[PDB]
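Q: Could you write out the predicted structure for this multi-component system? I'm mainly interested in how the pieces pack against one another.
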Amino acid sequence: LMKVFVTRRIPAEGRVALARAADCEVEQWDSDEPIPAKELERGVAGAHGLLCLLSDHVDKRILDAAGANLKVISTMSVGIDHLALDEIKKRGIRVGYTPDVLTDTTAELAVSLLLTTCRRLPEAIEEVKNGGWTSWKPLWLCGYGLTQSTVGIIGLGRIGQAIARRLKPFGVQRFLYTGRQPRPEEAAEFQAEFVSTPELAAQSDFIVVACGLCNKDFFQKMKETAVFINISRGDVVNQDDLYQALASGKIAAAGLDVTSPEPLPTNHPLLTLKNCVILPHIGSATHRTRNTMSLLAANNLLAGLRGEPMPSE
Amino acid sequence: LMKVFVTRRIPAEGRVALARAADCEVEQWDSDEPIPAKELERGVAGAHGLLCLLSDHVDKRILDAAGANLKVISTMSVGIDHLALDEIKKRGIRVGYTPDVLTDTTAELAVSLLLTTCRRLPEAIEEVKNGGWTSWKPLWLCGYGLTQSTVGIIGLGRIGQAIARRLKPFGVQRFLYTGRQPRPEEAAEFQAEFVSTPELAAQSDFIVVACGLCNKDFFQKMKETAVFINISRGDVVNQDDLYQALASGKIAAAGLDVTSPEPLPTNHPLLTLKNCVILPHIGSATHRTRNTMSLLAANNLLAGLRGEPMPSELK
């Protein structure tokens, strides 16, 4: 029997997998709220394996607390920059994470966020409830359509490719993309042209970061009728610059699944704007996906605690 | 000169086209608010042509008010139920409308509605605003994705196809279509199987009505985890039935672009349910599309005054 600590109540499919392992003795923080460092720094002590969430920061400070005794840390996220991973890939400890399995879902949410923003749905929902809807009106609540539009994707990775793929049949006539290295073969499916950052800001009607670059200079160069979407990290957006551009007309509207910090305080300037949709990082929030993440995180942990190779390391 | 009456302030492109027409005098209800029936009557009096909106119920009372002079009714809409066609046909009056021009934009909204409903965007937006967001939680605000799913399209016409076209790349495994007659030629594009009404409701994960059919019998056969979406007309939904379904968890969620009546009273039951999203009939609401609808409705009218072939005429 081996010591296994899980930081949070995880979706069933991962819990079942771990419950079926006669191999381990699993101790669980039976709560939906993120366990604080104080309880985590006694939780991991003497643990061969730990299953932890995006919330938890695993550092030289917690890795010591665990000691040589820990062989595997499995995290239930594609996101990596919360684990000290070069103190880790350090101690010869093996790391688990959950990529690819959330791709279609996040790219779906990105498009869902994009659509809801440009077609002005939240504002539309509110007018119905507040009494703004009086009749059918020709020029009322008009949005911006994807037909004959130019879309720019900052970060044409596996995730961004899934975005263009979904946007293609919406009558998009031109895809533009930018990044560190140009991707030739994966761009040909949508005929995505590789351009400079200024050019992408200048030409695009919609901009999606699928990766702080996105600041005042970037927002000035954007079309006044353009829509800006970000699903990657919060720290790529300069949030004061975003507020200033949205409030003064430099850009039409913005949609954010990620923010600085997370969560955003309820009294944040961006939340006082009607042309700014904010979501609480729901990119991968579906039953199917959260379950598969759970199970993929569970199998990674077990594979490591035993000695086998992993599905995702 | 031929009198023309416009029941509303229409987009510039159509409004301008009317102004340029030398053989006409354009009189207009200069407002974005709907014209009351009492005023419409005084407005159409001796008018040779009428440009109306789906809001204006052009019936016998109004047709009487106009008189012999009336030759054309051009409506700025694809939907036509607001016109009393039987009596219009009886007087030999020509009718123009606006199909096609709005196919893509309306398809666009339908997918928008679907995506925002199944991924619980409105519920999530409110949760950031009211302090419900405390941390990344692995089971919170979880919705239903379109990957490997089954989609059911009721009334697979031109809009129906356009919805399907856009939904394919979301990794949907099977499509199902329903009508009064099968459409095999124009539906090979998605491998859509033609099924009956009741057989669809049980098999599909997402249903889209595009064109009181949808009632307590209809929502019972649907999956516990299914999303209902309507963008056609209000009449096809039994709204007290839909509420019973959503509240009891018989179906997962619902999103509407149309209701009975329009607008809905702000005190309606449905508007209190978290898992029900209501949009104020905004299918075609984009600057460019409405502006084009406006232009076509104007061209329909002028040709119907001059006795010329109309670009888009209802028979």
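A: Regarding packing and overall arrangement: Chain B touches chain A through 72 residues (CB under 8 Å).
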